[PDB]
Amino acid sequence: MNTPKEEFQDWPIVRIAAHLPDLIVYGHFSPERPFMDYFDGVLMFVDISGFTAMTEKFSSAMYMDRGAEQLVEILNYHISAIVEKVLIFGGDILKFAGDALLALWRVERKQLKNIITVVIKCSLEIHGLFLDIRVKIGLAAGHISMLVFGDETHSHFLVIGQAVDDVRLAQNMAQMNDVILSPNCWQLCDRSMIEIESVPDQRAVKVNFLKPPPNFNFDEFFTKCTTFMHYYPSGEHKNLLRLACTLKPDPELEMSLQKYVMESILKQIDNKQLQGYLSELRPVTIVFVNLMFEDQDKAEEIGPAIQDAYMHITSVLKIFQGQINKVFMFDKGCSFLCVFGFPGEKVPDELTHALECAMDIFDFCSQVHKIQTVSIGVASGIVFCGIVGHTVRHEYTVIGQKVNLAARMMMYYPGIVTCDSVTYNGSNLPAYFFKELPKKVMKGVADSGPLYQYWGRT
Amino acid sequence: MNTPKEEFQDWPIVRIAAHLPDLIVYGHFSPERPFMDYFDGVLMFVDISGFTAMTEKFSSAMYMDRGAEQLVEILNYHISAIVEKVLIFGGDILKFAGDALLALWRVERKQLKNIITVVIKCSLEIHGLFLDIRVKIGLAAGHISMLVFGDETHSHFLVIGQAVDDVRLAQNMAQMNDVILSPNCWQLCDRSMIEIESVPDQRAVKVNFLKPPPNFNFDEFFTKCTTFMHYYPSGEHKNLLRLACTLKPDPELEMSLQKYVMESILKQIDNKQLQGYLSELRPVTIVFVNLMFEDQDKAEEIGPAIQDAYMHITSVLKIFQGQINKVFMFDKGCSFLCVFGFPGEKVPDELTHALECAMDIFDFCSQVHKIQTVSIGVASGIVFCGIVGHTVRHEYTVIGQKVNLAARMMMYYPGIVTCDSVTYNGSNLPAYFFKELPKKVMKGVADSGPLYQYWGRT
Amino acid sequence: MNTPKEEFQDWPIVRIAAHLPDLIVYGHFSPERPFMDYFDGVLMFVDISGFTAMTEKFSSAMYMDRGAEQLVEILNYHISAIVEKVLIFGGDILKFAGDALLALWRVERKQLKNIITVVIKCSLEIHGLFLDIRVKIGLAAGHISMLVFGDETHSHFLVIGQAVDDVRLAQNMAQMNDVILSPNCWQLCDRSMIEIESVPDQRAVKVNFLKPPPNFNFDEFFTKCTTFMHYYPSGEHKNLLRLACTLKPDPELEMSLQKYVMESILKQIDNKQLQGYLSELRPVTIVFVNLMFEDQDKAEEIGPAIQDAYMHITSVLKIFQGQINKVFMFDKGCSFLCVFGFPGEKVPDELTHALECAMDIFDFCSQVHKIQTVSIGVASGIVFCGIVGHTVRHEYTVIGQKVNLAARMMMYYPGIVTCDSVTYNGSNLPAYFFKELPKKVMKGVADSGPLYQYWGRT
Ligand SMILES: [Ca+2]
Ligand SMILES: [Ca+2]
Ligand SMILES: [Ca+2]
Ligand SMILES: [Cl-]
Ligand SMILES: [Cl-]
Ligand SMILES: [Cl-]
């Protein structure tokens, strides 16, 4: 009696789960919104510098209109290698944002010290792998909260707390090629093994190298650590990068998971649209919304408010034809990266709509109870839109100088709605709806032409 | 000199052969129509209860318009596992009809007893594998005839005879989870090994278990049995589920095989249409045609008549824009499951056309010589249309409460054309073309609203 | 720590490189045009007789409109097997033209004798593999030049010299199933091992068999030969047919390589169009342009002129909506196989345009300096268009009786523009723009109806 080859089945649930971390795939929590969970772990925030520049170069004529295709190919080739290291070292990739990603090692408190060693080693091997591109890595460790928010058909999650703020601070300090530990990470780690240098004006520290003691064997140490890793592929599945590759059809589970994924990606998963379609360099408008709270580390304070804001944001975006691409803690608060002009959401009046949408969101969110300040940055231009990451773990994202510009506007001009000149000039709105603003020198930004506040009708 | 990896070639002929049993793939018989062949074998008829209900639930809002996708995924996940067992145990899947399939073990007469043991074991392992779904299995054994019928561009086959009637009777008696043997099967089997209980008012019997004798080893027994299995994958191809996976391009053979497959499936095979396209939950009209004969077991009596009827059915369907989905022996006769509204055959007046087509077919077939009675049931609603089965053996089929309703109408209201209320109400035809009928309690049917006879113009 | 399966990545650069020989993929030469390189090698020219006939038969009704699909499947099944032998024996397939291909073994001069043995053995194994189809093979050896020509967005290459003329002469003499050596090949080969018969009126010779000496072992001999093969897959990659299967994303390299591939193929590579789309049997017009030079073996004489002609040809084709399918040395000169009506280049007035384009090209090229004679043959009909070869090495090409007719017209009627009757009759041009020509008996051609010179306006 034969025992024939059992071919890999790439069921739709498996393709869906590629777009999500184990934190959600195997999370099985309440459908109530908001939902909050608390745990500890080590976070790794990995940034590839230079793709933003590259994006602008891939619109040039030398790319012969295959710029999007070339950009995603060279990006994924690099990012995939990083994704594999994170996964082999036992991490869960939580989210991709442009050419960066955030990974988590969730463990019990007693195991943070040893897991920190594992992550540092991971980081050094990644810093290893890496012709104009640098890798910067920030690490943090401690208490983490998760929030899930959304409505009956859409779900989103985010992580919150001091470790989340710390990992992003650590990463902003990294010079090209550094691995930086948060103060708390340094404080919890196995200092007898990890050799650091101080960072000026900073309690965070830079990793120089591992200094293992005499009888230390990393493979044996790693194996002990896998005891604590719930989803590490093992035994018969030790040849797989993710346990999620073995997920089996389950309509309840798939209904729950699909709510995290955008409709155009589900179309592609369901072989109702060609893959090529989602890799594009297209003119869009970014609307980058920031909500600042009294205490951005206290999930049960901020969770209700994010949900409240999300309910209004989503209904307004539906009307003005925009979409939430990503949400994360960023700029002392919760940020929504929204996009006008994604697959199948073209219009004329896109610019006007992005501006009217932004004002509406600003007025509403300004009044929701624990929101201290709202800031919104609007910028328009050619940006890369596509699926970034590894075959087994990837997400739809946007990369482009205008994406960064909108984020920087929202941070340097708090408490108002701002726009760039392309949006100002392009919009059908009268000039006295706007105010020309003082030019601020902005981190990471060369020369935006004039910037404007969208004052609205008075 | 290298000996490089020889990658699997999924030639078009191989993809075609996935839609057909070895009985046709390796049959090499005359292109003359009708063509009849005679042999012996054991038949297995496997039914998954509950998908029909599920279908109705997958149109609900909780499925967020991915109902078709979810339904086919969960169906195929289960059915594929059954298909693999049948194939590993040496059977040929002849046909899929909704969430059921029919499998054949064709052997010489002297080998029926031993092969019956093999099939029972197969059945018990399948009953094994199987959250609202039961598996019912009927087995029969004996003489079988095959008919091939069609025209210069389309071919169809069916099996006929007492064993075919018996396997369907056996399966209608199975309580959830039973394996039932036909009287003749019980009479030919190795009774010293097979422990049964009687079935009330019935000569068919229920399998309780296998009671192997002392030195009996199933693997060695199975291996002896493979001597008689012409196409069992072996040697270098023992890792494959079907020998058909090795078929090589042959234009003569492919011309012959493609005639069994519908044009929209050939389009997909030829990568001229996205796969997603054929899995749908769409409103259609089922026209379920039954031809009753004096003796439905005598192929050479009935074969000419089925061909005659097919020639007219197909020309009328072409005019009224319908398609034959499936043909089989069912309801004391030969049944054609026809569909109005399949990929690319949308229209308005679909309902009217289905009714005029049904009348035309009724008048013509009523006059063909050995056809004793014609019955036709017409029902309209949302039904699942798609490819069901395993990667290596699958077919296009329809599942839905309206499919069952049309079959039951055709059986409970013989000798006339009947329709449901959706069709009555929806049609552009005057009310006095119809007659409102007495409500009959029907096996498997809750509450069809009113039913009607399509009387026609008088 | 796991070491998980590293799945084959079929990056776009890899898919591009399938369409090109190692001579270009790993060539890294100047982007200047024309560019010329010089080396030595052995050439193999392999022709499958009979597909041209088959093409005409695959338009018949028995193919039920899947003629293109069937033709490409049966063609590729045969051609793929030849491609694998060439590759396993260490050759580089340079180009496909219809049902023929040209392969190169590039080596240093001292190694030609031994490599000739390898190629003969290859040829005999191929003649081995080969229901109406014969394989004819011609071999040549010696000095070879390569020319690359084109503009900022398109590139083409060709090989030139006596060995290139010889391999095509050798192949025209081969009777069904022969392997023929050029005079120079015979002169350089290891005559103590290769047993030949003379060919009447010819210095070229026919291979009867290999006569190895006593201690000769072909595997050991082949292994010694692999020392000289730069790109032979080895070690960890010994299971691959081409080293190109391992190419890694590199935007510079991909920009350079894509210029050789037509836009509709890049569309398919980029998953922006279904694969089925490019296999077609469609009515087109072939415009077969031949440039004759004083000395067609002297690349530095002829290279500038081919570039000059290409610059004008391409701009005129752009205007009249044609495309260069292929360029090669053929008919005592450089030939351009151009096509009117390829994917997405339909029009009415196609025939007129092909004729006005041909005249324009004739007038211009007639005046470029070292071009002695221009001849152009125009023929219209149903031809097969599609990707021919092996998964790892394949190209877009055209096969059809009208392709051959246009080539034969251009050779038998030199120095003028000629057209067939379909084109004459179909064109919107007045009859006195043409002259009816004397019927010539033409090699490989049954009965073209009348042929015409396109005289133009006087
Ligand atoms: Ca970045
Ligand atoms: Ca059923
Ligand atoms: Ca040829
Ligand atoms: Cl997050
Ligand atoms: Cl049947
Ligand atoms: Cl060439």
Q: How far apart are CA A456 and CA A434, in angstroms?
A: 7
- Three-state SS for A186-207 is HHHCCCCCEEEEEECCEEEEEE
Cβ pair C88:B4 closer than 8 A: yes
Chain C CA closest to residue A237: C4
Residue C193 burial by CB count (10 A; 0-12/13-18/19+): exposed, middle or buried? middle
* Nearest-angstrom CA–CA distance, C348 and C28: 42
Residue B62 backbone class (left: φ over 0; alpha: ψ -120 to 50; beta: rest): alpha
CA dihedral for B219, B220, B222, B227, sign (positive or negative): positive
Number of H helices, E strands in chain B: 14, 16
Three-state SS at C420: coil
Give the closest ligand to the alpha carbon of residue C92.
6
3-state secondary structure of A332: coil
Per 3-state DSSP, what percentage of chain A is helix, strand, and coil (rounded to 5)?
40, 30, 30
Residues in chain A: 458
Using CB atoms within 10 A of its CB, is residue B153 exposed (0-12), middle (13-18) or buried (19+)? Answer: middle
Q: A2 and B73 in contact by Cβ < 8 A? A: no
Tokens in use for A73?
């190919």
Is A274 in Cβ contact with C273 (below 8 Å)?
A: yes
* B74 to A12: CB separation less than 8 angstroms, yes or no: no
Contact criterion met (CB below 8 Å) for A185 and A42? yes
Cα end-to-end span (Å), chain A: 82
Q: How many other C-beta atoms lie within 10 A of the C-beta of residue A248?
A: 11
Per the structure block, which two tokens stand in for B394?
A: 């699958």
Please answer yes or no on whether B276 and A270 come within 8 Å at the CB atom.
Answer: yes
Distance in Å, CA B164 to ligand 5 centroid: 8
Task: Write the CA distances from C207 to C90, C119, C182, integer angstroms.
Answer: 21, 12, 11
Gap between the Cα atoms of C73 and C60, Å rounded:
17
Q: Which residue of B has its CA nearest to C122?
A: B1
- What CA–CA distance (Å, rounded) separates C207 from A163? 77
- B429 annotated as a binding-site residue: no
Q: Which ligand is nearest to the CA of B135?
A: 2
Out of C239, C241, C276, whose CB is closest to B272?
C276
| Paired tokens of C136 | 């004819």
Nearest in space to B206 (alpha carbons), one of B172, B170, B179: B179
In the complex, which subunits touch A with 3 or more CB pairs below 8 angstroms? Answer: B, C
Here the tokens at position C81 are 């097997």
What are the structural domains of chain C?
34-244 (3.30.70.1230), 277-458 (3.30.70.1230)
Residues A437/A453, Cβ–Cβ less than 8 Å: yes
H-only helix segments in A251-398: 251-258, 263-269, 299-320, 350-365
Q: Which residues of B91-109 are buried (b: 16+ CB within 10 A; e: fewer)?
A: bbbbbbbbbbbbbbbbbee
- In chain B, residues with a C-beta closer than 8 Å to the C-beta of C62 are 255
The beta-carbon neighbor of C255 closest among A62, A238, A391 is: A62
3-state SS class at C19: coil
- Taking CA–CA distances from B122, the nearest residue in chain A reads A1
3-state helix, strand, coil in chain C (%, to 5): 40, 30, 30
Q: Smallest CA–CA separation between B1 and chain C, in Å?
A: 7
The single-letter DSSP state of residue A438 is P
User: Would you put residue A68 in left (φ > 0), alpha (ψ -120 to 50) or beta?
Assistant: alpha
Q: Reduced to 3 states, what is the DSSP secondary structure of residue C261?
A: coil
A206 is in an annotated binding site: no
Considering every ligand atom shown, identify the ligand nearest to the alpha carbon of residue C99 and give its number.
Answer: 3
Distance from CA of A259 to the nearest CA of B (A): 9
For the record, the structure tokens of B276 come out as 């997603």
What number of C-beta contacts closer than 8 Å exist between A and C? 62
Any idea what the Cα angle at residue A422 is, between residues A417 and A425, rounded to 5°? 90
- Side-chain-side CA neighbours of B73 within 13 Å: the count stands at 27
User: A115 to chain C: which residues are within 8 Å by CB?
Assistant: none
Residue B51, classed as helix, strand or coil, is helix
CB C144 within 8 A of CB C102: no
Residues of C in contact with A80 (CB under 8 A): 9
Q: Which ligand is nearest to the CA of B100?
A: 2
What type of residue sits at position A27? G
Nearest to B421 by CA among B411, B412, B431, B413: B431
* Residue C150: C-alpha distances to residues A296, B365, B380, C324 (Å): 60, 69, 62, 12
Residue A157: CB atoms within 10 Å: 22
Angle, CA C56 vertex, CA C51 and CA C60 arms, to 5°? 130
Whether residue B415 is annotated as binding a ligand: the answer is no
Q: Which residues of A touch C12 (CB under 8 A)?
A: 69-70, 73
Beta bridge partners of B95: B102
Is the dihedral angle over the CA atoms A268, A271, A274, A275 positive or is it negative? Answer: positive
How far apart CA C412 and CA B320 sit, in angstroms, is: 56
Chain C: list its partners (3+ Cβ pairs within 8 Å): A, B
Residue C64 to residue B255, Cβ atoms within 8 A: yes
Across the interface, whether the CB atoms of A89 and C1 are under 8 A apart is answered yes
Find chains touching chain B: ≥3 CB pairs under 8 Å: A, C
- How many residues belong to chain C? 458
Give me ligand 3 centre to Cα C47, in Å. 6
First to last CA, chain C: 82
In angstroms, the CA C134 to CA C139 distance is 17
Q: Where are the alpha helices (DSSP H) in C136-198?
A: 162-173, 183-188
Return phi, psi of residue B356, to 5°.
-65, -40
Which run of H or E residues covers position A83?
Answer: helix A67-88
Q: What single-letter DSSP state applies at residue A369?
A: T
Per the listing, tokens 């910037």 go with A451
Q: How far is the CA of C159 from the centre of ligand 6 (A)?
A: 5
Contact B262, B323 (CB under 8 A): yes
For chain B, what is the largest distance between any 2 Cα atoms, rounded to a whole number of angstroms?
82
3-state secondary structure C183-202: HHHHHHCCCCCEEEEEECCE
Backbone angles phi, psi at C334, to 5 degrees: -100, 125
Per the listing, tokens 């290279």 go with C303
What distance lies between CA A202 and its chain's CA centroid? Answer: 25
- For the beta carbon of residue C377, count every other beta carbon within 10 angstroms: 30
Q: How many CB atoms lie within 10 A of CB C424?
A: 23
Distance from the CA of A370 to the center of ligand 4, in angstroms? 20
Largest distance between two CA atoms of chain A:
82
B70, B89, B239 member nearest A251 (Cβ): B70
How would you classify residue C349: left for phi > 0, otherwise alpha for psi between -120 and 50, otherwise beta? left
CA–CA distance, C337 with C325 (Å, rounded to integer):
6
Distance from the alpha carbon of residue B139 to the mean position of ligand 2, in angstroms: 16
Residue B208 assigned ligand-binding role? no
Considering only CA atoms, which of C53, C58, C49, C103 is closest in space to residue C78?
Answer: C49
Rg from Cα positions in chain B: 22
Place of tokens 């969960």: B74
One-letter amino acid at A88 equals: I
What tokens appear for B235 in the block? 């040697």
